[PDB]
């Protein structure tokens, strides 16, 4: 079981993105109590504006209404109005009130937090003037920074658990983790983005998050790390033979972590191996000429 | 914490080894007396540790040591151990005599 | 290496007559094993995030445990003796033996 | 228990935020004696400008009166004059004077401080220009930066104590405040905003401030921090059984404070626990292994 | 070469006198043994110079 921790940032969900813009040019009348950094819910009034670009088209609709126009002479002058910009919403008011629409109220498309706000009291609004950028955070995103070298340490079967210092009281629940196709050129780090259920908005975007990773490896012989004696030329472990005879044996290390090494070969499951007092014993067998014998027996 | 706060190991040490001294600013006469200008700066509480400044934004919000590390108190590195009567390890000392005396 | 993975001292707290050491270091877990060191996190100058193995190879190996030297050059000894036996003759048989084979 | 004093800053009210732009293109005639950093009040003249554009329609109206056109005919041309952008008050002037309005005057929509002002004499003016950006500061704002860590606490804080160096006397007990949903990334802090009243205009935007917090969390399991043997990942404590021997115990940590760590689990109340990581050697005494030697 | 590479005499010296030492990183127990953490850094080949 490979285990390694990584740093991570809690971020806004980028699939919760909405940059509101006016369908046509006009001027701002009212701007509701709001600003960047605030949290708006789907429906919140952003600002009031007067758009004259449609006045001419709407009146020609009301004209026909009173002059006994055709049913289809309306559906056609309403799409002439539909693809002019005027929102189907503000249009439904036109037909249900028979009055010209001059003042409209832009609202927040999604539940989220405002990150941008370029229009304020007294200005004139333009087709591009982003009235308000609102980013969500319900299924909040959290991305971890994996070093290009340790990349191999992550696979499909890999188990993940998030932990946020800001909240030691909230058990997190990951629902989708992804290994982005590219690697941050700026930090030489693989990007691992995973979205976590933020039901109660207790996991704010920008706060630290620690991602611990668990990864299954190839099936191998497994012994404790205290058991492996490494002299940078030979890998040995002191075996406890049937009779109680301490006999050293050479093994071949594969990888190790969590205080448990893994030999690629050199032993046999069921076999016993010393953990505590391993040093004295090895030394005793070194004096005894055992380690010398074992190495000579080949 | 380092990666997250944009602070390096190199930076923390230099910041640490620059916030644990006392300063003398000469004297200053008044009432025909001699007033000495002392300046605090030694580490005393563990807070003085937690509150080592590493990074300060233009805004005014600083980033302290407590943000990149914990400050636990523990033992040191030993070169030798002493044990008494098998029922406990303790510390003591030997008295060494001036050779000839 | 020195500070992060080693218990490197870096300061002292002045507490009355007493004086205690202050040292910087990573959490023990980050330095448990050789492999651990190969994944030692480093925050490079360019705020890049890499491991110790990305800038070095680490290998286990045996070697000297204490370097005894005499006269400013490295000198290994050779302990030859006899139980009882003679003296003023053996060392002579060797000053000519060694320097002749 | 907690006793921290977060850093904060006085700033303008962003709900009192006006950006005066001309309804239509024109050219500046006279610009009043104002500039960035000045204090203005609702009605303060900003600049005079000539705007040719409503002339066409203003004529259409005046002409209609010269030949008494239909009521709805005038109601119509006056609306084309509004939708075309033109102060509801300047139209009001048109009908009164019965003369085409060529010169106009932009004025401060609300009282505040001129933070921006980029239109002077001899210039022209476009609909995207900014004749004046005026930001109020009556209910002045203060935004403190609280360490991300104690998010679990500040969420349910009763009251803070806002102090400020500039005015050592204007110290009050903030009881209502809005904890923002965003956490700074440069630093890792929470954003806490609060509106303090500025009748005397003493708290000027750009002054340092302090938000004190003296509170204590809900009752939890508490052990002396000097008793928590913590390695990078794994970590326990040293319990003392009835017979007075040592036995390690895997514990989960909530968070420490002033020399005591709140414990999430691992051990129940009462259990005696030694208060020392001094039973191992700081210089690599493999904590996992050194803890093993204590049991058999 | 200095002018062409944007390096100063002052810089080269400081860079040189910071790449010719050895470092000790305490010890590290494992198998109840005492493993010492040595770190290379001395100049040996002329390549280490280049």
GROMACS .gro file of N, CA and C in nm, chain A residues 48-111:
model
  192
   48UNK      N    1  -3.083   4.726  -1.253
   48UNK     CA    2  -3.190   4.765  -1.344
   48UNK      C    3  -3.131   4.848  -1.457
   49UNK      N    4  -3.180   4.826  -1.578
   49UNK     CA    5  -3.131   4.899  -1.694
   49UNK      C    6  -3.242   4.927  -1.794
   50UNK      N    7  -3.222   5.029  -1.876
   50UNK     CA    8  -3.319   5.065  -1.980
   50UNK      C    9  -3.261   5.038  -2.118
   51UNK      N   10  -3.321   4.942  -2.188
   51UNK     CA   11  -3.275   4.904  -2.321
   51UNK      C   12  -3.377   4.945  -2.427
   52UNK      N   13  -3.340   5.043  -2.511
   52UNK     CA   14  -3.428   5.100  -2.613
   52UNK      C   15  -3.420   5.028  -2.748
   53UNK      N   16  -3.327   4.935  -2.762
   53UNK     CA   17  -3.303   4.871  -2.891
   53UNK      C   18  -3.423   4.790  -2.941
   54UNK      N   19  -3.519   4.764  -2.852
   54UNK     CA   20  -3.632   4.678  -2.886
   54UNK      C   21  -3.766   4.751  -2.888
   55UNK      N   22  -3.767   4.876  -2.842
   55UNK     CA   23  -3.891   4.952  -2.834
   55UNK      C   24  -3.967   4.954  -2.966
   56UNK      N   25  -3.895   4.973  -3.076
   56UNK     CA   26  -3.957   4.987  -3.208
   56UNK      C   27  -4.025   4.858  -3.251
   57UNK      N   28  -3.963   4.745  -3.219
   57UNK     CA   29  -4.016   4.615  -3.259
   57UNK      C   30  -4.139   4.576  -3.177
   58UNK      N   31  -4.135   4.607  -3.048
   58UNK     CA   32  -4.245   4.572  -2.958
   58UNK      C   33  -4.373   4.647  -2.994
   59UNK      N   34  -4.361   4.776  -3.022
   59UNK     CA   35  -4.477   4.858  -3.055
   59UNK      C   36  -4.546   4.808  -3.182
   60UNK      N   37  -4.466   4.764  -3.279
   60UNK     CA   38  -4.521   4.712  -3.403
   60UNK      C   39  -4.596   4.582  -3.378
   61UNK      N   40  -4.566   4.518  -3.266
   61UNK     CA   41  -4.640   4.399  -3.224
   61UNK      C   42  -4.773   4.438  -3.162
   62UNK      N   43  -4.771   4.537  -3.072
   62UNK     CA   44  -4.893   4.585  -3.008
   62UNK      C   45  -4.985   4.650  -3.111
   63UNK      N   46  -4.925   4.711  -3.212
   63UNK     CA   47  -5.000   4.772  -3.321
   63UNK      C   48  -5.092   4.668  -3.385
   64UNK      N   49  -5.033   4.559  -3.432
   64UNK     CA   50  -5.108   4.452  -3.496
   64UNK      C   51  -5.212   4.392  -3.402
   65UNK      N   52  -5.178   4.384  -3.274
   65UNK     CA   53  -5.269   4.330  -3.174
   65UNK      C   54  -5.403   4.403  -3.176
   66UNK      N   55  -5.397   4.535  -3.180
   66UNK     CA   56  -5.517   4.618  -3.177
   66UNK      C   57  -5.581   4.633  -3.315
   67UNK      N   58  -5.502   4.610  -3.419
   67UNK     CA   59  -5.551   4.623  -3.556
   67UNK      C   60  -5.586   4.487  -3.616
   68UNK      N   61  -5.625   4.394  -3.530
   68UNK     CA   62  -5.667   4.262  -3.574
   68UNK      C   63  -5.566   4.191  -3.663
   69UNK      N   64  -5.444   4.177  -3.614
   69UNK     CA   65  -5.340   4.108  -3.688
   69UNK      C   66  -5.361   3.957  -3.686
   70UNK      N   67  -5.285   3.886  -3.768
   70UNK     CA   68  -5.297   3.741  -3.777
   70UNK      C   69  -5.222   3.673  -3.663
   71UNK      N   70  -5.269   3.555  -3.624
   71UNK     CA   71  -5.205   3.478  -3.518
   71UNK      C   72  -5.059   3.448  -3.552
   72UNK      N   73  -5.033   3.422  -3.679
   72UNK     CA   74  -4.897   3.392  -3.724
   72UNK      C   75  -4.819   3.520  -3.757
   73UNK      N   76  -4.891   3.630  -3.775
   73UNK     CA   77  -4.827   3.760  -3.793
   73UNK      C   78  -4.773   3.810  -3.660
   74UNK      N   79  -4.787   3.727  -3.557
   74UNK     CA   80  -4.739   3.760  -3.424
   74UNK      C   81  -4.622   3.670  -3.386
   75UNK      N   82  -4.640   3.539  -3.402
   75UNK     CA   83  -4.535   3.443  -3.373
   75UNK      C   84  -4.409   3.476  -3.451
   76UNK      N   85  -4.426   3.543  -3.564
   76UNK     CA   86  -4.315   3.580  -3.650
   76UNK      C   87  -4.251   3.712  -3.610
   77UNK      N   88  -4.329   3.800  -3.549
   77UNK     CA   89  -4.277   3.929  -3.504
   77UNK      C   90  -4.227   3.916  -3.360
   78UNK      N   91  -4.245   3.798  -3.302
   78UNK     CA   92  -4.200   3.771  -3.167
   78UNK      C   93  -4.065   3.700  -3.167
   79UNK      N   94  -4.035   3.629  -3.275
   79UNK     CA   95  -3.903   3.570  -3.293
   79UNK      C   96  -3.810   3.675  -3.354
   80UNK      N   97  -3.869   3.766  -3.431
   80UNK     CA   98  -3.797   3.884  -3.479
   80UNK      C   99  -3.747   3.959  -3.356
   81UNK      N  100  -3.821   3.942  -3.247
   81UNK     CA  101  -3.789   4.005  -3.120
   81UNK      C  102  -3.704   3.911  -3.035
   82UNK      N  103  -3.722   3.781  -3.054
   82UNK     CA  104  -3.652   3.680  -2.976
   82UNK      C  105  -3.502   3.682  -3.005
   83UNK      N  106  -3.467   3.674  -3.134
   83UNK     CA  107  -3.327   3.672  -3.175
   83UNK      C  108  -3.271   3.813  -3.196
   84UNK      N  109  -3.338   3.911  -3.136
   84UNK     CA  110  -3.285   4.046  -3.132
   84UNK      C  111  -3.212   4.064  -2.999
   85UNK      N  112  -3.234   3.970  -2.909
   85UNK     CA  113  -3.173   3.974  -2.777
   85UNK      C  114  -3.274   3.959  -2.666
   86UNK      N  115  -3.378   4.043  -2.670
   86UNK     CA  116  -3.480   4.044  -2.566
   86UNK      C  117  -3.512   3.904  -2.517
   87UNK      N  118  -3.489   3.880  -2.387
   87UNK     CA  119  -3.506   3.749  -2.322
   87UNK      C  120  -3.650   3.699  -2.330
   88UNK      N  121  -3.666   3.570  -2.359
   88UNK     CA  122  -3.799   3.510  -2.366
   88UNK      C  123  -3.879   3.543  -2.242
   89UNK      N  124  -3.810   3.558  -2.130
   89UNK     CA  125  -3.873   3.593  -2.003
   89UNK      C  126  -3.938   3.731  -2.012
   90UNK      N  127  -3.858   3.832  -2.044
   90UNK     CA  128  -3.908   3.968  -2.058
   90UNK      C  129  -4.009   3.979  -2.172
   91UNK      N  130  -4.008   3.882  -2.262
   91UNK     CA  131  -4.103   3.879  -2.373
   91UNK      C  132  -4.240   3.831  -2.327
   92UNK      N  133  -4.241   3.732  -2.240
   92UNK     CA  134  -4.366   3.678  -2.187
   92UNK      C  135  -4.444   3.784  -2.111
   93UNK      N  136  -4.372   3.883  -2.058
   93UNK     CA  137  -4.437   3.995  -1.991
   93UNK      C  138  -4.501   4.088  -2.094
   94UNK      N  139  -4.435   4.103  -2.208
   94UNK     CA  140  -4.486   4.187  -2.316
   94UNK      C  141  -4.624   4.142  -2.362
   95UNK      N  142  -4.638   4.012  -2.388
   95UNK     CA  143  -4.762   3.956  -2.438
   95UNK      C  144  -4.871   3.949  -2.331
   96UNK      N  145  -4.829   3.938  -2.205
   96UNK     CA  146  -4.924   3.923  -2.095
   96UNK      C  147  -4.959   4.056  -2.029
   97UNK      N  148  -4.911   4.166  -2.086
   97UNK     CA  149  -4.940   4.298  -2.032
   97UNK      C  150  -4.973   4.398  -2.142
   98UNK      N  151  -4.943   4.361  -2.266
   98UNK     CA  152  -4.972   4.445  -2.382
   98UNK      C  153  -4.909   4.584  -2.370
   99UNK      N  154  -4.814   4.598  -2.279
   99UNK     CA  155  -4.741   4.723  -2.263
   99UNK      C  156  -4.598   4.710  -2.313
  100UNK      N  157  -4.541   4.820  -2.359
  100UNK     CA  158  -4.403   4.822  -2.405
  100UNK      C  159  -4.307   4.801  -2.288
  101UNK      N  160  -4.204   4.721  -2.310
  101UNK     CA  161  -4.104   4.696  -2.207
  101UNK      C  162  -3.981   4.784  -2.229
  102UNK      N  163  -3.950   4.866  -2.129
  102UNK     CA  164  -3.839   4.961  -2.139
  102UNK      C  165  -3.734   4.937  -2.031
  103UNK      N  166  -3.779   4.901  -1.911
  103UNK     CA  167  -3.690   4.875  -1.799
  103UNK      C  168  -3.688   4.727  -1.762
  104UNK      N  169  -3.568   4.670  -1.754
  104UNK     CA  170  -3.553   4.528  -1.721
  104UNK      C  171  -3.465   4.510  -1.598
  105UNK      N  172  -3.479   4.395  -1.532
  105UNK     CA  173  -3.401   4.364  -1.413
  105UNK      C  174  -3.319   4.237  -1.432
  106UNK      N  175  -3.189   4.253  -1.451
  106UNK     CA  176  -3.099   4.139  -1.467
  106UNK      C  177  -3.081   4.068  -1.334
  107UNK      N  178  -3.084   3.935  -1.337
  107UNK     CA  179  -3.071   3.855  -1.215
  107UNK      C  180  -2.957   3.754  -1.225
  108UNK      N  181  -2.920   3.696  -1.111
  108UNK     CA  182  -2.814   3.597  -1.105
  108UNK      C  183  -2.860   3.463  -1.162
  109UNK      N  184  -2.795   3.418  -1.270
  109UNK     CA  185  -2.829   3.293  -1.337
  109UNK      C  186  -2.813   3.169  -1.249
  110UNK      N  187  -2.710   3.168  -1.164
  110UNK     CA  188  -2.683   3.051  -1.080
  110UNK      C  189  -2.658   3.089  -0.935
  111UNK      N  190  -2.667   2.991  -0.846
  111UNK     CA  191  -2.625   3.008  -0.708
  111UNK      C  192  -2.473   3.011  -0.705
   0.00000   0.00000   0.00000
